[PDB]
Short mmCIF file of C-alpha atoms and ligand atoms in Angstrom, two decimals:
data_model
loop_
_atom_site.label_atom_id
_atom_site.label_comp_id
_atom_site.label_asym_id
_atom_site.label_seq_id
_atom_site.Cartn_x
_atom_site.Cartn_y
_atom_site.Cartn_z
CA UNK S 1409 128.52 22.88 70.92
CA UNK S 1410 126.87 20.01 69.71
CA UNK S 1411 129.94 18.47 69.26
CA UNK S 1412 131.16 16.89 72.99
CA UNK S 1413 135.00 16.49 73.26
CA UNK S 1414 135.26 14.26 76.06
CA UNK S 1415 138.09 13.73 78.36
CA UNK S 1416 139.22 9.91 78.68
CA UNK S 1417 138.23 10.13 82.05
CA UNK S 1418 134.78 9.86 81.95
CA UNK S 1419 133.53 7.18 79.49
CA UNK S 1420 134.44 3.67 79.85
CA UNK S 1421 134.49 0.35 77.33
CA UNK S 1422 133.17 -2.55 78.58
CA UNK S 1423 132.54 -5.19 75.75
CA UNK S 1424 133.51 -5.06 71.97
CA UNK S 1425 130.76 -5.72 69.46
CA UNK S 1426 133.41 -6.05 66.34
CA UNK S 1427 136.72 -5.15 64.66
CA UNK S 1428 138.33 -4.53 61.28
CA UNK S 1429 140.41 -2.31 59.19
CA UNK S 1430 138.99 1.06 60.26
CA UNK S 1431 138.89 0.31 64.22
CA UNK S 1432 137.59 -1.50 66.77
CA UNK S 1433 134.11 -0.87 68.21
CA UNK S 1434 132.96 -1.26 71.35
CA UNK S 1435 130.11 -0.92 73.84
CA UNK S 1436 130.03 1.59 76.79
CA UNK S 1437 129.10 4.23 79.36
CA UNK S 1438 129.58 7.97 79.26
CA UNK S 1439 129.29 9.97 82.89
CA UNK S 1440 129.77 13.60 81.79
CA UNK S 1441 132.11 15.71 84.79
CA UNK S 1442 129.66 16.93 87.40
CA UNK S 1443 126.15 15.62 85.74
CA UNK S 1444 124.63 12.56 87.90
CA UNK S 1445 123.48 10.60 84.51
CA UNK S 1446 124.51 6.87 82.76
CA UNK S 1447 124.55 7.37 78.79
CA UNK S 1448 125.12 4.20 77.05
CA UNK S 1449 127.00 4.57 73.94
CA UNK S 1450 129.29 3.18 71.54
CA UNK S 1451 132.96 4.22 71.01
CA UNK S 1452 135.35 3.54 67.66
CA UNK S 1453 138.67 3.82 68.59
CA UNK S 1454 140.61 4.47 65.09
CA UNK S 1455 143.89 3.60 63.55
CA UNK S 1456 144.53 6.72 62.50
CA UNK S 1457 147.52 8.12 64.07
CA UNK S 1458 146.25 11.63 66.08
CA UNK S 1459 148.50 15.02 65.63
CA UNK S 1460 148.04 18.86 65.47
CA UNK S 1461 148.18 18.72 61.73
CA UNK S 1462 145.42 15.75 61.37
CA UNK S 1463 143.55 16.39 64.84
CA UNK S 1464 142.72 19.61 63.14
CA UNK S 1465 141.36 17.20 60.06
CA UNK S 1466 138.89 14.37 61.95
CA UNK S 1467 137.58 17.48 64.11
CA UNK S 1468 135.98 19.44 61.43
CA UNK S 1469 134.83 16.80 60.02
CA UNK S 1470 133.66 15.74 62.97
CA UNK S 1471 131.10 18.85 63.94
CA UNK S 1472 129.54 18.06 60.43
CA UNK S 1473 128.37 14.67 61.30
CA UNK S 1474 127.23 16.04 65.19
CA UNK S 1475 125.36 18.70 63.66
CA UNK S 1476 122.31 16.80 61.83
CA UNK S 1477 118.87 16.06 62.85
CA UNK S 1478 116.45 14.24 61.64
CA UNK S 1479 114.68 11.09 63.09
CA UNK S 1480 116.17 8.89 60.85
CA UNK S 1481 119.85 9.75 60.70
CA UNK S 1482 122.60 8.68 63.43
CA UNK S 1483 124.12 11.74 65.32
CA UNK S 1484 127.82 11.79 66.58
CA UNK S 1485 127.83 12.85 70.00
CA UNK S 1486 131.36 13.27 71.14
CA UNK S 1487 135.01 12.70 70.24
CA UNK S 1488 138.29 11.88 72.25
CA UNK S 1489 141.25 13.03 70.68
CA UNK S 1490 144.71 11.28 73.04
CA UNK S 1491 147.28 9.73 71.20
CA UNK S 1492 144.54 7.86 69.70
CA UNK S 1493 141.06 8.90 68.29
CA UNK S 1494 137.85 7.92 69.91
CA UNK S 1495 134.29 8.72 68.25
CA UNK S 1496 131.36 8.57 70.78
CA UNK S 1497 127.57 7.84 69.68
CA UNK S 1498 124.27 6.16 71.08
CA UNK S 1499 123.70 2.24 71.47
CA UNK S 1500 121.45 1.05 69.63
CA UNK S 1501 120.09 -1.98 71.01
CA UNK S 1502 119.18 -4.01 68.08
CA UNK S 1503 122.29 -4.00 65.81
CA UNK S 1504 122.28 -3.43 62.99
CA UNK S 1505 119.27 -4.49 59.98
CA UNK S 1506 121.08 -6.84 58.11
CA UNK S 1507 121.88 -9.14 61.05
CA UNK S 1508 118.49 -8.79 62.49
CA UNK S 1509 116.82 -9.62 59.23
CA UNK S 1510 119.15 -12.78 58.98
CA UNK S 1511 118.62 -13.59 62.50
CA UNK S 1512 114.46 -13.12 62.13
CA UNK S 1513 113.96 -14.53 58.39
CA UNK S 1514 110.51 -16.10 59.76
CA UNK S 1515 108.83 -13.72 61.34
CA UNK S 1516 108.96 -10.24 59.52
CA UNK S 1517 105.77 -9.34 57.90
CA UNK S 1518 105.39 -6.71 55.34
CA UNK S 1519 104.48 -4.31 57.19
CA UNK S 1520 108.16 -4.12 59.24
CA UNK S 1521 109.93 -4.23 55.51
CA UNK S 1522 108.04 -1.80 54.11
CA UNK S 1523 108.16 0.92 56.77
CA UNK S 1524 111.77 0.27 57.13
CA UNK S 1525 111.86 1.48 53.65
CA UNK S 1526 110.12 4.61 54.33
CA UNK S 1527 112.52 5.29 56.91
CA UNK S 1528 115.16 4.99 54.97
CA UNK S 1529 113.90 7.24 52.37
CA UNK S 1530 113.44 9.12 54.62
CA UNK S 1531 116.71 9.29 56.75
CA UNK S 1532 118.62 9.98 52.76
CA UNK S 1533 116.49 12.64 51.95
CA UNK S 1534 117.38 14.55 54.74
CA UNK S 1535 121.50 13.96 53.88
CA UNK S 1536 120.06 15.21 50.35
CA UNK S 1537 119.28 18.36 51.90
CA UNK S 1538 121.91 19.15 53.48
CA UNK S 1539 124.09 18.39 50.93
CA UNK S 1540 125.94 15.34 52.76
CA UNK S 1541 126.20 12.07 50.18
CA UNK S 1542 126.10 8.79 52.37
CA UNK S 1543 129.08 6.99 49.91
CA UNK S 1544 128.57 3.61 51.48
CA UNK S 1545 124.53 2.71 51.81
CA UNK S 1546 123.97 -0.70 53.17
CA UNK S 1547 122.26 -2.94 55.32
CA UNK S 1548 125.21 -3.14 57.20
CA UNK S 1549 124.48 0.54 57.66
CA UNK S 1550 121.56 0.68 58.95
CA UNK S 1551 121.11 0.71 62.52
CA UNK S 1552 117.70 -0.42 64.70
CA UNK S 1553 116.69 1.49 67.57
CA UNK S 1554 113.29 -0.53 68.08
CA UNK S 1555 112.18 -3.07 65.44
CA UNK S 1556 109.59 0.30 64.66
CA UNK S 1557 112.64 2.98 64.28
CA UNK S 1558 115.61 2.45 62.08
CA UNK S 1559 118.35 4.56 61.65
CA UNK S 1560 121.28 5.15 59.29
CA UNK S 1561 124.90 5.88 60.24
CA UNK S 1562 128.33 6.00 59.04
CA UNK S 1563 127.78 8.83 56.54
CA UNK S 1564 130.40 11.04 54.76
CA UNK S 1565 133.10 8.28 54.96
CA UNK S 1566 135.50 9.15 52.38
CA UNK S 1567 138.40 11.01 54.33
CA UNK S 1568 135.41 -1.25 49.02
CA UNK S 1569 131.52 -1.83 49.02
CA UNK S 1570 132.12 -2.14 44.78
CA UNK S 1571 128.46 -4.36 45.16
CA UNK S 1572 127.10 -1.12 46.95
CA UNK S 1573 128.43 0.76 43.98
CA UNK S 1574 126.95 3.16 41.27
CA UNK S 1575 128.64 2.31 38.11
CA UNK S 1576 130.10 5.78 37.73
CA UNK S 1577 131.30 5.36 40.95
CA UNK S 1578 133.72 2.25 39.82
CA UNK S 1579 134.74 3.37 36.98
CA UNK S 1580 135.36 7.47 37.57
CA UNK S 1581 135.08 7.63 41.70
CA UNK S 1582 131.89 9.50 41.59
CA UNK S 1583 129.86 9.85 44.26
CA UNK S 1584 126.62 11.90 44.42
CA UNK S 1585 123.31 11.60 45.70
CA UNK S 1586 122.27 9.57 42.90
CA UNK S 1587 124.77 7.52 43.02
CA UNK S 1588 123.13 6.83 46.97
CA UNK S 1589 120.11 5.99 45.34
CA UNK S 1590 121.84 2.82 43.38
CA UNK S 1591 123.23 2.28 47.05
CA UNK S 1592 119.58 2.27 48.40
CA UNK S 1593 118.58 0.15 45.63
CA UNK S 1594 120.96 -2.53 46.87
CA UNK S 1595 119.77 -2.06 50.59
CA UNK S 1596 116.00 -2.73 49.61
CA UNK S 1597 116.90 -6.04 47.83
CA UNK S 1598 119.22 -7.06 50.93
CA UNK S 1599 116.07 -6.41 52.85
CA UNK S 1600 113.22 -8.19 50.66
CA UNK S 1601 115.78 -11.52 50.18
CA UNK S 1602 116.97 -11.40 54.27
CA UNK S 1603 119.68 -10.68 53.98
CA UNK S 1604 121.10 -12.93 50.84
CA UNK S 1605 124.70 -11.55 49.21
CA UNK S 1606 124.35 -9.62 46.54
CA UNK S 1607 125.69 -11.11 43.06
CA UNK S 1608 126.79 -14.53 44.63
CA UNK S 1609 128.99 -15.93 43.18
CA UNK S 1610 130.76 -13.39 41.08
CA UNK S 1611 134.21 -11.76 42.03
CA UNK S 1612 134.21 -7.84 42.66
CA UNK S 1613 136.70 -7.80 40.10
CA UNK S 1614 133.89 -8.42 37.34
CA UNK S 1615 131.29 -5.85 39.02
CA UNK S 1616 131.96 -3.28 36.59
CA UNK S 1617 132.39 -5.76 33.68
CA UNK S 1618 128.92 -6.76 34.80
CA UNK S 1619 126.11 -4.32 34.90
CA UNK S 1620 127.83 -3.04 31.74
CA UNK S 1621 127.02 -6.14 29.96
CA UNK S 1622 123.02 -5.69 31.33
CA UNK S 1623 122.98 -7.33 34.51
CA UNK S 1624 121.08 -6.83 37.93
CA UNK S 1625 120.05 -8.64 40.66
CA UNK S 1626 117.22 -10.74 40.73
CA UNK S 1627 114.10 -10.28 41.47
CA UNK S 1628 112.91 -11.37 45.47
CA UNK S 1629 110.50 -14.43 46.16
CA UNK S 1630 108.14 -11.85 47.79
CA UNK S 1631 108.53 -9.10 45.74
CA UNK S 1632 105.97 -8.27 42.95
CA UNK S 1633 106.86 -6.50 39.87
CA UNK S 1634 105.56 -3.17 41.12
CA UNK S 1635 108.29 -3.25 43.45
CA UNK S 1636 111.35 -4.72 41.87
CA UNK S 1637 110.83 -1.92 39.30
CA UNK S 1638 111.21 0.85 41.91
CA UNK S 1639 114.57 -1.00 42.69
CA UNK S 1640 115.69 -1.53 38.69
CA UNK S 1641 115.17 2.02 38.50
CA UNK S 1642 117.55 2.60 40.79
CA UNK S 1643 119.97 0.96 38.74
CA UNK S 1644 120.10 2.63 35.52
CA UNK S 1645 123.43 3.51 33.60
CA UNK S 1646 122.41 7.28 33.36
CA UNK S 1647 122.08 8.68 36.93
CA UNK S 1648 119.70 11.46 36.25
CA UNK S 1649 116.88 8.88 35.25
CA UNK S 1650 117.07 7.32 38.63
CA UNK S 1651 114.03 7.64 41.19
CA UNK S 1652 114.89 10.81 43.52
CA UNK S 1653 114.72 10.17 46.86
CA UNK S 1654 111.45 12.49 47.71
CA UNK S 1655 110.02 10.38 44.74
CA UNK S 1656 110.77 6.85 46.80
CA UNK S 1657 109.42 7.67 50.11
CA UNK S 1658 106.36 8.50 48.44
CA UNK S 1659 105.73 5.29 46.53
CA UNK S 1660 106.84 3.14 49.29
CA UNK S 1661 104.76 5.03 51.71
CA UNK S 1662 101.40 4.25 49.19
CA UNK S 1663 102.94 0.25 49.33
CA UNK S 1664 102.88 0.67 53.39
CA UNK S 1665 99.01 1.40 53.63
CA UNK S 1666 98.19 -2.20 51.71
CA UNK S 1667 101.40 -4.25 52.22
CA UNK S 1668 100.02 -7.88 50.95
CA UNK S 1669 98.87 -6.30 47.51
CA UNK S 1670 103.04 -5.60 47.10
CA UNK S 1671 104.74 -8.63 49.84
CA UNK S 1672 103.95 -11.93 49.52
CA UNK S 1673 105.27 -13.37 52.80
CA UNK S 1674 104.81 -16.85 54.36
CA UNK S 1675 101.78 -16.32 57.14
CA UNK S 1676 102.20 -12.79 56.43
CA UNK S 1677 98.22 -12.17 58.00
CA UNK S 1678 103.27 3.12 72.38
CA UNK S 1679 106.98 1.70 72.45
CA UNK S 1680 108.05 3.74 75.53
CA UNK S 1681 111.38 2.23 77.08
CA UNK S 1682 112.44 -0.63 75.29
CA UNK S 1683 115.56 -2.78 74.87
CA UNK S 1684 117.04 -5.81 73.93
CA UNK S 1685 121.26 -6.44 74.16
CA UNK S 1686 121.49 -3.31 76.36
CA UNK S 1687 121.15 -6.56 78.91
CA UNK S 1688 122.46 -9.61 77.57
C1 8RC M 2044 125.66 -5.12 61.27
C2 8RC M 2044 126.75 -5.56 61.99
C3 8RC M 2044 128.22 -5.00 61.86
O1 8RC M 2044 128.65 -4.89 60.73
N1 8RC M 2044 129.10 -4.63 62.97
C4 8RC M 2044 130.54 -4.08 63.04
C5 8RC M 2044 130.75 -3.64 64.53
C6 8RC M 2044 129.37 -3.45 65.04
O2 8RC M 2044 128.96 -2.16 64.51
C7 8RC M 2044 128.21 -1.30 65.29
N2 8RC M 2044 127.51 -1.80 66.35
C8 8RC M 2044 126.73 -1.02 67.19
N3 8RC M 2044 126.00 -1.65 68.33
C9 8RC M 2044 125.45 -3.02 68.47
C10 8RC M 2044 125.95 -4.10 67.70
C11 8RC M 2044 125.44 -5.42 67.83
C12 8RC M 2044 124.40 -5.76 68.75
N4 8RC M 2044 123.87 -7.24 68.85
C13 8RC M 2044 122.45 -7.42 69.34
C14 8RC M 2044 122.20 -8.85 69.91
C15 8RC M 2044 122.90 -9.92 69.13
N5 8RC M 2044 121.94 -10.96 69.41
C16 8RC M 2044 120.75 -10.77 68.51
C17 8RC M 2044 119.65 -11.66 68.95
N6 8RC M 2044 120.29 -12.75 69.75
C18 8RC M 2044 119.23 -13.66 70.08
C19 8RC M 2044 120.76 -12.22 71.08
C20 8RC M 2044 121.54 -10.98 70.84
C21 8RC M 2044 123.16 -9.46 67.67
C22 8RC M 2044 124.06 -8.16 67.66
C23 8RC M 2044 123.90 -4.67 69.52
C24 8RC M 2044 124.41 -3.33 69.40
C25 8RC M 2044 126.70 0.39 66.88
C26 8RC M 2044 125.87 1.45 67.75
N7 8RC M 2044 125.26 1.21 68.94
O3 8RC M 2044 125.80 2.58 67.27
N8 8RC M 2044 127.42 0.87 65.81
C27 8RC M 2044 128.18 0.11 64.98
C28 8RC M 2044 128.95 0.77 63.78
C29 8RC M 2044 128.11 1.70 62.89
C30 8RC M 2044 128.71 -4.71 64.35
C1 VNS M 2045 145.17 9.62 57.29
N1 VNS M 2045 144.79 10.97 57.69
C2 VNS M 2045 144.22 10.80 59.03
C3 VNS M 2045 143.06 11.75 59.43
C4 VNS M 2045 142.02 12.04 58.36
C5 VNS M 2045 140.64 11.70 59.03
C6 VNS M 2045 139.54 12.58 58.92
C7 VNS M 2045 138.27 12.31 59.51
C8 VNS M 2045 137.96 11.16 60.27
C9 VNS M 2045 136.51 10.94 60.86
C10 VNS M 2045 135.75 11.99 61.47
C11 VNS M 2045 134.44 11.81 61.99
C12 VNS M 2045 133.81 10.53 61.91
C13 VNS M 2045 134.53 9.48 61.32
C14 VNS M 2045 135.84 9.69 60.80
C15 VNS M 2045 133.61 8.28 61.39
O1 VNS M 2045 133.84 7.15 60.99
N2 VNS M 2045 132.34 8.58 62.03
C16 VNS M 2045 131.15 7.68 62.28
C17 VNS M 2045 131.31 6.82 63.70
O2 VNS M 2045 132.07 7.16 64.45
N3 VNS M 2045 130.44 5.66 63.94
C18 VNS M 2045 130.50 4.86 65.13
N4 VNS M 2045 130.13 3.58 65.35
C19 VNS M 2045 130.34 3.13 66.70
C20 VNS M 2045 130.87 4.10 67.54
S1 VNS M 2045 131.11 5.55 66.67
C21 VNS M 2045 129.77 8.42 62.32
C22 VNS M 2045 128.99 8.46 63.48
C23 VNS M 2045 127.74 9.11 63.52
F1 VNS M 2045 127.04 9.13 64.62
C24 VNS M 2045 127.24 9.76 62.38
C25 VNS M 2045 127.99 9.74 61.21
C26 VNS M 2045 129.23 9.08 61.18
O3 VNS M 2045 129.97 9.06 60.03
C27 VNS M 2045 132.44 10.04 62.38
C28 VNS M 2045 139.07 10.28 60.36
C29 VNS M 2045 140.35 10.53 59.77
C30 VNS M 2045 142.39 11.29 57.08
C31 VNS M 2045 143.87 11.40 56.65
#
């Protein structure tokens, strides 16, 4: 029941906030039948071509990915199934992290990195425990609620991020929740350089040729050492001597309560009701 199958009826599309491969997204309204409330949400509508045989398919999957809860992780609300596919969740009003830390380079302090870290600890733990790996980690991924609440989303997506990737996972498709924590290793440095491309300059056809030849990515301008080795760690060859994820919400959490000692950021020296493109 926590999964909503909506009739087409009562949500509407309004504006599209991007398109690809996968589907187009857009930004909406949902009215359920009968209850006197506006819900604003945003709909993917799919390529995939619906059917008994594969409606049966996105809808299991689909009560999965309605079903978790946790602060920090992106519930799926509803799903309309026509003769196309619609998936239904909340706006968030921000965007998502990467272009708001592109679109803010000046003004984040270490305080907002940091605690974005936590959260996203935070938000992968939780998929750790209920057994649900992520497969595609990324600031693109992560969603902002407030500039004080992030959120991941798009979990589970496996029915090519090879920058994003584990080396296991290029070479022998494996994907496990260590392999996520190479993933989040990524994410942090997207975060700590604002949003720079990871390994610019080399083609994805050399990724795996790469790291197995002893390379990483560089170490941030604001980092110090004692936190570019919490994200090297995260990007060793044998997966079982990465950091867990319990392990990096606590050492990121200790970083949060001093944040200069760990970010060195240029003039680096409750939140009831609050929007910003829900408008304009
Ligand atoms: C990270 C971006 C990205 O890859 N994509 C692909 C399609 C979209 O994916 C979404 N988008 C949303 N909702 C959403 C997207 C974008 C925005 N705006 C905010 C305002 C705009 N400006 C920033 C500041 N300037 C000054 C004025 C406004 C930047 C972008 C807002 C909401 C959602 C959702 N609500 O769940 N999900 C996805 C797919 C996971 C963008
Ligand atoms: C070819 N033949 C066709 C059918 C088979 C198939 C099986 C399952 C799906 C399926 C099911 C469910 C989802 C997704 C995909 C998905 O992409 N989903 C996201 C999500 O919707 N995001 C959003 N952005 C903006 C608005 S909705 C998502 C949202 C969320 F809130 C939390 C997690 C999450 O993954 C959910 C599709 C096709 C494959 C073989």
């Amino acid at each position: 029941a926590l999964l909503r199958i909506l009739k087409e009826t009562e949500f509407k599309k309004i504006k599209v906030l991007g398109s690809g491969a996968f589907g187009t997204v857009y930004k909406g309204l949902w009215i359920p039948e009968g209850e006197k409330v506006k819900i604003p949400v945003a709909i993917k509508e799919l390529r995939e071509a619906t059917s008994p045989k594969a409606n049966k398919e996105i809808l299991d999957e689909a009560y999965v990915m309605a079903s978790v809860d946790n602060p920090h992780v992106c519930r799926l609300l509803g799903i309309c199934l026509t003769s196309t596919v619609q998936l239904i969740m909340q706006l968030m009003p921000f965007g998502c992290l990467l272009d708001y830390v592109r679109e803010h380079k000046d003004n984040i302090g270490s305080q907002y990195l940091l605690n974005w870290c936590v959260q996203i600890a935070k938000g992968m733990n939780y998929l750790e425990d209920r057994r649900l790996v992520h497969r595609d980690l990324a600031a693109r991924n992560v969603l902002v609620k407030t500039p004080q609440h992030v959120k991941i989303t798009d979990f589970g997506l496996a029915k090519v991020p090879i920058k994003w990737m584990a080396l296991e996972s290029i070479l022998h498709r494996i994907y496990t929740h260590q392999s996520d924590v190479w993933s989040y290793g990524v994410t942090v440095w997207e975060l700590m350089t604002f949003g720079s491309k990871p390994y610019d300059g080399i083609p994805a056809s050399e990724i795996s040729s790469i790291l197995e030849k002893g390379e990483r990515l560089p170490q941030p301008p604001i980092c110090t050492i004692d936190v570019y080795m919490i994200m090297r760690k995260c990007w060793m060859i044998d997966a079982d001597s990465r950091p867990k994820f319990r392990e990096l919400i606590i050492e990121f959490s200790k970083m949060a309560r001093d944040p200069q000692r760990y970010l060195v950021i240029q003039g680096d020296e409750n939140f009831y009701r609050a929007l910003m493109d829900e408008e304009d």
